[PDB]
């Protein structure tokens, strides 16, 4: 087919330069297509839906019940009961007993051996 | 032996827990982490003490078990243990259910079993069990004519939907949402909440949003739904405009008015979340701290606004992004630094920080993206495929073609369809450019690839909302016409006369709406605006005066961004012809000069 452009001469026509628009786009990403992935999810998370259960218990002053309080490395089913706490991805900051009641402090100290807590990653 | 009263043990379990929450934002070392979990350990053990060493009533057993299991779920990986406690509790409650009001407790057992535990597990195997049992539960409850069980059945229908989403059963999700929504009371907080979940899910997947869901979203009433959920409505309406590249001015003004009148509501309500009272004794608490907290919300809105202006790039809108993405970044840094208790798990704060970090990653990513648009060069990874996309574009910029880079990115399973499609379109452009300039020998291997890549573009486009995005729809039309018509290609691909008229007709719509002097309206994406006017000017305009004015404008427009020299050169050839035909001597001289200048730059 005939077009005036390719017929007539002009600067660069003999050089290695794109003379038609599609060839000009070979080394030009369509960057005006700005990706938006993750933005909707950002609105959607973090999200929690829960069922609040507000019911007071152990209110009867006459209640006489009391409590006796003095109480592996291989793949096992017993490790279902052994507590494994979650290693967090981050530190929330860049003495934690302060503020605890004396009784809470006392029970905590008496049972310090049981505090060999295991913290693990997913 | 050492003894404490039953209430003293119970309150100690609470004290240890609540004190851990009080310092949850102060863990800066291993020592602090040991102390935090040391407290949680004691709290759990004290709870276990009650269950094993005391005779608890059903209500006492319920309360203790729930508080304890709440910690197992949020603080530990002991999900099987948690499940055993709830399952045990459930069976005990059922034994007394006849002569004791225990429905609330039983339904909470089911919620923990079917919603909380599976979500924390995040295991496909357990999701299938949960979904199976959840559907069984719903089927059983809808058969009860009682209003309480009918409402509870609605809650667990919603749980089922959430389980379908996690299992990526997208057809089931849509079916379940529709069935769920259709049974809800119209113009209720509950229905409008579920519809927001629906719209957000669709946007996350970039699925087309049905009209009824759209109208349901717009009809959402602030005073019925509350300021927290309405902020979510407004946010989603912003994302919708962003995804379709629509105008956000109206939607910005709505947020403005909302803040003026409901700022105080969000600030005074901060932390307490959103409580949806479905029924008396059926209350759902909803937490969305990024949207429900005033500072966090504005931060998100500023991000969305800035992202929407990226494509504008060089003008005043672009300058906004370059100015305020840094603000979003710095604000986010402070939100991380000044994160507070409470009284929520350290792990809740941990997840919020992780989201904050993703926002930082978005700021950096879009900074680089806007610079790439501006300069025509590449110098994060908040979403899948973003890093290697920028790397692929870098190769293409360097004349490396980047077919293999784009192809591999379009084939990876973790990447969004949007990224896949950008990769396929760039890949098509490269291959089509090669069909044009390559000899007849390699023409065989290049045209099939064009046809192959193109069908892939059509397939993905047809199952995303991008098919309703004018920038995207126009890009498709432009690229098809460029590859099927001279003088836009030397070797145009074969096509029927019906196909030509089809795409030419699409062009006419975009060009008549975006000609250098209605959802065919294109944002001022520089490269796009030039190509549409170039294509329209070449194919649709007959008048010499009009053709000259358009070619002149196209020619000059190219200067606004880097990387546009070869495009400008081709445009320059066209403009030179129009000058030559019009016999405009001065304009021929200047245009030839500009072409000479472009040749010297390009051939460096």
Query: What does the overall shape of chain A look like?
Result: elongated
What shape does the CA trace of chain B take? Answer: elongated
Strand order of the largest sheet of chain B: 2-3
Radius of gyration of chain A, in angstroms, nearest whole number? 35 Å
Residue share in helix of chain B: over 70%
Q: What sequence of helices (H) and strands (E) makes up the elements of chain B?
A: EHHHHHHHHHHHHHEEHHHHHHHHHHHHHH
**Multimeric organization:** heterodimer
Strand content of chain B: under 5%
How much β-strand is present in the residues of chain A?
5-15%
Q: What does the largest sheet of chain B look like?
A: 2 strands, antiparallel
Q: Please tally the helical runs of chain A, counting DSSP H or I stretches of 4 or more residues.
A: 4
Number of strands of chain B: 3
Helical coverage of chain A, percent range: 10-25%
Integer-rounded radius of gyration of chain B: 30 Å
Largest interface pair: A-B, 91 and 170 residues
Pfam families (chain B): Cohesin_load (PF10345)
Protein name (chain B): MAU2 chromatid cohesion factor homolog
Subunit structure (chain B): Interacts with SCC2 to form the cohesin loading complex.
Organism (chain B): Saccharomyces cerevisiae (strain ATCC 204508 / S288c)
């Amino acid at each position: 087919l005939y077009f005036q452009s390719n017929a007539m001469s002009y600067p660069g026509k003999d050089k290695n330069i794109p003379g038609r628009i599609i060839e000009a786009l070979e080394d030009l990403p369509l960057s005006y297509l700005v990706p938006k992935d993750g933005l909707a999810a950002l609105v959607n998370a973090p999200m929690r839906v829960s069922l609040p259960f507000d019911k007071t218990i152990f209110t009867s002053a006459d209640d006489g019940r009391d409590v006796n309080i003095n109480v592996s490395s291989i793949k096992n089913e017993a490790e279902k009961e052994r507590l494994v706490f979650k290693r967090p991805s981050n530190f929330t900051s860049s003495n934690f007993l302060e503020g605890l009641s004396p009784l809470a402090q006392s029970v905590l100290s008496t049972h310090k051996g049981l505090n060999d807590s295991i913290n693990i990653e997913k | 032996g050492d003894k404490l009263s039953i209430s003293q043990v119970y309150h100690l379990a609470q004290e240890y827990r609540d004190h851990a929450y009080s310092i949850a934002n102060k863990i800066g070392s291993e020592e602090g982490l040991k102390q935090y979990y040391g407290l949680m350990n004691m709290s759990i053990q004290m709870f276990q003490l009650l269950k094993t060493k005391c005779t608890l009533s059903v209500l006492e057993d319920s309360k203790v078990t729930f508080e304890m299991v709440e910690l197992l779920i949020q603080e530990t990986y002991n999900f099987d243990l948690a499940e055993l406690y709830i399952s045990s509790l459930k069976e005990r409650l059922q034994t007394h259910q006849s002569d004791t009001d225990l429905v609330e407790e039983i339904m909470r057992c089911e919620f923990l079993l079917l919603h909380d535990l599976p979500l924390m597990r995040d295991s496909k195997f357990h999701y299938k069990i949960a979904l199976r049992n959840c559907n069984e539960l719903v089927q059983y409850m809808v058969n009860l004519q009682d209003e309480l069980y009918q409402n509870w059945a609605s809650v667990f229908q919603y749980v089922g939907v959430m389980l379908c989403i996690k299992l990526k059963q997208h057809r089931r999700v849509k079916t379940s949402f529709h069935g769920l929504l259709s049974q809800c009371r119209e113009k209720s907080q509950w229905k409008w909440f579920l519809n927001l979940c629906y719209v957000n899910y669709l946007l996350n997947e970039r699925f087309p949003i049905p009209e009824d869901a759209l109208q349901e979203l717009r009809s959402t009433e602030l005073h019925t739904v509350g300021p927290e959920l309405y902020a979510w409505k407004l946010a989603l309406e912003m994302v919708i405009q962003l995804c379709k590249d629509g105008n956000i001015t109206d939607h910005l003004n709505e947020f403005k008015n909302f803040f003026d009148t409901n700022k105080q509501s969000l600030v005074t309500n901060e932390g307490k979340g959103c409580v949806i009272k479905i029924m008396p004794r059926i209350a759902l608490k909803v937490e969305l701290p990024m949207i429900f907290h005033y500072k966090e919300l504005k931060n998100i809105l500023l991000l969305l606004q800035s992202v929407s202006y990226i494509v504008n790039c060089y003008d005043e809108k672009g300058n906004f992004s370059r100015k305020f993405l840094p603000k979003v970044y710095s604000t986010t840094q402070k939100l991380i630094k000044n994160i507070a208790a409470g009284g929520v798990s350290m792990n809740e704060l941990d997840s919020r920080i992780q989201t904050y970090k993703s926002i930082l990653e978005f700021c950096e990513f879009y900074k680089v993206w806007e610079q790439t648009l501006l300069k025509g060069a590449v110098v994060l990874g908040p979403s899948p495929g973003y890093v290697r996309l920028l790397q692929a574009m870098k190769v293409q910029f360097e004349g490396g073609g980047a077919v293999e880079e784009y192809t591999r990115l379009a084939q990876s399973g973790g990447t969004s369809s949007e990224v896949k499609m950008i990769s396929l379109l760039n890949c098509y452009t490269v291959q089509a450019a090669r069909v044009s300039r390559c000899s007849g020998d390699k023409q065989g291997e290049l045209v099939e690839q064009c046809n192959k890549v193109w069908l892939q573009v059509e397939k993905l486009l047809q199952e995303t909302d991008l098919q309703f995005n004018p920038i995207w729809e126009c890009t498709v039309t432009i690229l098809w016409l460029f590859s099927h018509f001279e003088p836009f290609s030397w070797n145009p691909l074969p096509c029927s006369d019906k196909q030509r008229a089809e795409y030419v007709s699409k062009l006419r719509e975009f060009y008549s709406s975006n000609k250098f002097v209605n959802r065919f309206k294109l944002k001022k994406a520089l490269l796009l605006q030039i190509l549409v006017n170039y294509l329209g000017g070449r194919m649709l305009e007959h008048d010499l005066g009009e053709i000259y004015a358009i070619s002149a404008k196209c020619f000059d427009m190219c200067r606004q961004q880097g990387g546009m020299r070869k495009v400008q050169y081709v445009i320059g050839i066209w403009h030179l012809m129009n000058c030559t035909v019009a016999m405009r001597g001065k304009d021929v001289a200047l245009t030839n000069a500009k072409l000479e200048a472009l040749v010297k730059q390009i051939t460096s």
